[PDB]
Amino acid sequence: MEHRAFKWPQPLAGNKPRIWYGGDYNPDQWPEEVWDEDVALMQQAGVNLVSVAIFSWAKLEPEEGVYDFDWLDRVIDKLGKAGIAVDLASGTASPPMWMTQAHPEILWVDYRGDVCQPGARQHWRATSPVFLDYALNLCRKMAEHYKDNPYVVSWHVSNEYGCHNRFDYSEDAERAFQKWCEKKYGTIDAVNDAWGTAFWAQRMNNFSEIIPPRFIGDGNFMNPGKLLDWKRFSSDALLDFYKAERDALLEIAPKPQTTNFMVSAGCTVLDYDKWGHDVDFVSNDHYFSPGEAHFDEMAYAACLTDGIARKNPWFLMEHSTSAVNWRPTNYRLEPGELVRDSLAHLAMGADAICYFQWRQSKAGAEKWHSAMVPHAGPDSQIFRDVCELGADLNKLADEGLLSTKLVKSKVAIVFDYESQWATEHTATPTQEVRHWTEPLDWFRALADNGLTADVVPVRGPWDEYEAVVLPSLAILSEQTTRRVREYVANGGKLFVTYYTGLVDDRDHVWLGGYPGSIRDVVGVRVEEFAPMGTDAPGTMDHLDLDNGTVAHDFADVITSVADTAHVVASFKADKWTGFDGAPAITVNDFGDGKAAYVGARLGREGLAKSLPALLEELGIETSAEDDRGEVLRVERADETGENHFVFLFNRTHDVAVVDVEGEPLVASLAQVNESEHTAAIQPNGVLVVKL
Amino acid sequence: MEHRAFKWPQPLAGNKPRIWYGGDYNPDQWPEEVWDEDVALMQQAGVNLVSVAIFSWAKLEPEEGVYDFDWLDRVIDKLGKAGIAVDLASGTASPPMWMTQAHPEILWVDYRGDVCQPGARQHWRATSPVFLDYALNLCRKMAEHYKDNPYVVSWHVSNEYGCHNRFDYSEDAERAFQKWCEKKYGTIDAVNDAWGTAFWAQRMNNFSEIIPPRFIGDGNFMNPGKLLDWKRFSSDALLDFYKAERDALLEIAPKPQTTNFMVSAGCTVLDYDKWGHDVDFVSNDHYFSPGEAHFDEMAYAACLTDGIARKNPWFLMEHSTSAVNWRPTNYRLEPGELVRDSLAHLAMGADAICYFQWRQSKAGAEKWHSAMVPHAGPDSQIFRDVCELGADLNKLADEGLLSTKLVKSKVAIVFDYESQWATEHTATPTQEVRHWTEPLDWFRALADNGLTADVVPVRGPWDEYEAVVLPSLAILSEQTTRRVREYVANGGKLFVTYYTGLVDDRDHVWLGGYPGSIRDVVGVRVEEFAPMGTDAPGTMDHLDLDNGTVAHDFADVITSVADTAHVVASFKADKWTGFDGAPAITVNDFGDGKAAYVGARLGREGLAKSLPALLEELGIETSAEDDRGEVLRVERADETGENHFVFLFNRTHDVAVVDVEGEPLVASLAQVNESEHTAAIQPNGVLVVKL
């Protein structure tokens, strides 16, 4: 699996490279007089790039085989004459009404056989031959028309594939899933073994007896190997679609191209790491998580984006100035968070910072989604902040930030889209445990101990790191198992948690005691699990540990510990539970390395309090400073090290004081004292320094 | 309604009778080399019976009209040569893919018209002519092939009928429900009156205008007489199917036969009491309820199983060594509970103890369901415990337990599958009240007072008992009413609760004041109900009683008390409610007997605290010992009384001390002191003594 050669949208002729800054722009929603005010405000704000025509199919092709590009030619000329570059869409993200009215077979079908109608967006089947023909046609018409346009710097292919059309249960998807399985497994016998079909009379005679995981009565249990493969197939089918659109544009009008991802701690619609191999550059859409997780989760998501990009610069295609429209309660951003959030992504390696969207819609389903120009207009705190950010990004580019890379951490936290999928089955030990929460909890606990981790996809080079976290990494394939065993034996330092290595990549259990492929690495054997909760009176809902932490949701029953291992922490419990004095946290010597095993869910707080002991045991150095968890420190450097930037973010609701170890470039809710070379960072503030 | 003659699986030639011990066995999921280890482990564990081929249709009939029995012949020979008997399945529990692909009319249909697909199990219509033909065909092929096999001791017909396919809304079920109604009622006028169809323009001109209770818009109110009959019809339709499979096997290969039930406090998929009339012996599948209810609910379920069996020995076809796969949080068993749970069923009259399943599946939807041989293998606490239980059951059979019966209690708690169904309508006084909880609450409150009740189905001989509980028994037919009135007048002692006797068997209300058919038995008249909860601010959520208990969810408004009755307890409340000083608990003299009325939901705790007074008033004797509720005492005896066994189970999280009134045979987490003839029973422990 090779990545494509890296390509990045280049400046308009006569311009110097900049941190690209701007947003989705939808002039087609407004009368044309508004466009001249849009351009003048964009110049005021320091906007240098916008993404246009994303959902414009019904205007670009208003009837079948009739094209209307003149409006788009005119707005692209206005932008370009003002020095603003265009990231042009294919226009294919969502089909017009004339098309679905004429071709109802385009619409995707749900698990009960109910057809998804128009009225929102992206109501098309990934495996529809007729929709593909319509989409490639528009791609080609667009490419031919814009191939020589001097103001178009990149292609934005479709939009957030799979946000709405991940799953289709049509006859098209039935046929395509049969073909996928044949191309993966080769024989029906191989499919039967993978899916364990001897159970419940599911054994198939040929590929025609492979059906999608349709409606089986709510509450009943779908074949888990088949469900896992369904999610892989669904991601692959949309990848195929993306690659076909891409290729159709590039054959006529080669330009840097991307499609926008939805990388966030809890979003696993697609295997985004896999997809990252087919974009010229990684672009991401991230919106804040409400409440206390806001800052840490956004840093973690931008960190994972950078891991997907293999530390190449990446493109923040979307985020929000303030509230989104799509949550049950759409909380606003607090003062300072607009600037802070943008610099968080920048810190984690973005060389472009863009919003959804330029002007707040006055009608339609996202009218309540914040924008760069709110309903309130340019006389607004949001627009002032947008202008301030624009000046900030010009300064940072003047000072050499472009093309610098996020520095390598001591610690790689491993993330696997497929492990998440495996943990989503409805007949696992507990529905309260999924893969995705554990890596985020580690990121935050490590930050509390003064350490900024890298978040590395399982395919990526986590085995080149000083230390590695396997966080509820439910799948360990034969390959990954080998990589883990070799990494530790050669001197790596490993953290492994509960719900790691239960299964291989077919969702077959590794037998003999969990974790079945690496018991000797971690030097423990688990014979069963003890899920916990409050489902009924008298259920076991927690387990204390003797290091002052508390387990919830899940604990392992460890029945033996290797002679090369020792117990760092033990459970304390009522005797009748069997847990009193049982091992909870262990550390094993394996070859020249070490592996710690955390046999329960301890949360961010439990991990943060357990880590000092474990970091010491594994020889991983951190600050001695008491205030070490108050700020997240994020660094970017060029290869030589001549351009080295430090971003300091307050993670707390107190004022944080930091040393200033170079020239302060940008400050937001932060005050520098030149005398003492110190700075006080308010809540929600950030300071950027060049070393 | 007669029961079939009792028959029980007999020993293999040359063996003596044993408590059958073993589990579901699925060699078809494993390579054949595993089978020789399975047999050797089964011998080590003392396993003497296994149930085979339950879901093996896709291997037994791999294409239409092609049979492959050689694998099954080979594993049955290995088992039998090792002295292990086979409970052979029909194999018909779930159809193969080739069959449903060729015959989509087999699949059951949901209330909206959506067809249940393959991908799990039991996706067939109870009233499908073509599925019946396929099932009877396999039954006959199986019977002909195994009719002279010396190692097959019984038939296990299908599997848990109605677990998944209770309700079908197809055209087949439409036709079959019309015929059922005609065969029940005779005329359409009788159906119209039963269902109250003059209400809401539902009156029918003929049987063709009877339709199933399909989709009527979510939240709207289905005709309740029709819904009640639907549940009776659905149980009958699957009973018809079972009887046809049974008959098809027995015509060729007569052997003891059963089908496995799902008797538990809250499961009412089928009228299991009715079904019990068509099995040769009762077999049950019971899995623990999480938390504090675990022990008491399992004892209660095994007790009800024995009531269904009319005190004949019965067969525990399934339970779990530890966690199941199918709850949202799959809690494990604690140390000692494997042995304890098994002996609980044994205590309540089982002469066979079997698990789902022998070897934990490594793939498929139940891979996370515990087994006798876990993923961890034979070197596991579970497998050791399985071996220990095996030796325990050999000892108890050596000591004469087989064919002894659960001793008659002083108290019969009445259970009615149909009353539960009636309480399930969505326009009852409150959705918080169902029939099934009240009998369980009584069982537990009576145990707290030192009394082990019998749980007797309404058709059964509850009127032969010293005292009887009617626990939220919503239906009283004319017949049951007569039985109650005569039972009390002749000297019976009766407890009646709220939500008893509201309706007759058509769901018509008994008029004139509740409970409308027995007001004079209980010597109270209720004019309305006062449901309670926390649905909105300021709702009435409890009512104190003056005996130190608290009502929740529901109270009766009692407006008069007979001259032959007196008030035992009264509500205390805010004046404006109307409840201050109102009657809550009464006792009436009726003929030579007495009837207590408990006009509210008091819970296990409220009932346990109310019972001393009521037991005294009704002359029902219990221990004077203060510790009387700490252990459940369960007895089995032969008819003479020469073989009398007492099982003592600790119900608490303290150590319980008991007297030893005979020879201790089996102890689990219990220590006997020969000197003092006493024993200390740990939490989760049990002692078995022969008197």
Numbering used by the authors:
A (entry chain A), B (entry chain A): 1 to 691
Q: How do the authors describe this structure?
A:
Aim: Bifidobacterium longum subsp. infantis uses a glycoside hydrolase (GH) family 42 β-galactosidase (BiBga42A) for hydrolyzing lacto-N-tetraose (LNT), which is the most abundant core structure of human milk oligosaccharides (HMOs). As such, BiBga42A represents one of the pivotal enzymes underpinning the symbiosis between bifidobacteria and breastfed infants. BiBga42A has a three-dimensional structure similar to other GH42 enzymes that have three domains consisting of a (β/α)8 barrel (domain A), an α/β fold (domain B), and an anti-parallel β-sandwich (domain C). Glu-160 and Glu-318 in BiBga42A were predicted to be the acid/base catalyst and the nucleophile, respectively, based on previous studies of GH42 enzymes and sequence alignment.
First, we determined the structure of the WT enzyme complexed with glycerol (WT-GOL) at 1.7 Å resolution. The electron density of a glycerol molecule, which was used as a cryoprotectant, was observed at the active site, even though the crystals were grown in the presence of Gal. The asymmetric unit of the WT-GOL crystal contained one molecule of BiBga42A, and it forms a homotrimer with symmetry-related molecules by a crystallographic 3-fold axis. A PISA molecular interface analysis calculated that approximately 27% of the entire surface area of the trimer (17,082 Å of 64,278 Å) was buried. Our previous study using calibrated gel filtration chromatography also suggested that BiBga42A forms a trimer in solution. The trimeric structure of BiBga42A resembles a flowerpot, like other GH42 enzymes. The glycerol molecule in WT-GOL occupies the C2-C4 position of the Gal.
